[PDB]
Amino acid sequence: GSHMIAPLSVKDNDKWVDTHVGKTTEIHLKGNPTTGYMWTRVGFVGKDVLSDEILEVVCKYTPTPSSTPMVGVGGIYVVLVKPRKRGHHTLELVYTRPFEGIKPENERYTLHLNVK
């Protein structure tokens, strides 16, 4: 109860909703790995695995090259959130710079899932 996240009205992310078990929720997020930030799970930015025991977040950061050339190693962010347990789970996906660090001024994408 100290200093909230304060959701901006210029960006809609955190999906406050329910779900089922192991309901593999695939999310093909777009962006640009060559911009500076990254679309992964907060607190795991840089690690090998984002998930743990709660949400089987099988995410794969694919920076596939351009169409024909190779001057663009930018792809997407494939996130597979499989509710391992039943209860209050959430996919904390944030837009941070693995090179620098994570900050509040960064984008958000918390796919909330009140796994029944």
Spatial separation of the C-alpha atoms in residues 79 and 51, rounded to whole Å:
10
Comparing CA positions, the residue from 47, 76, 35, 88 lying closest to residue 110 is: 88
- Specify the CATH class of 1-116 in words: mainly beta
To the nearest 5 percent, what fractions of the chain are helix, strand and coil?
A: 0, 40, 60
DSSP 34-63: TSS-EEEETT-TTSS----SSEEEEEEEE-
Q: Which residues pair with 28 in a beta bridge?
A: 78
The count of C-alpha atoms lying within 13 angstroms of the C-alpha of 99, restricted to the half-sphere facing its C-beta, is 6
Q: How was this structure determined?
A: NMR
Domain boundaries, the chain: 1-116
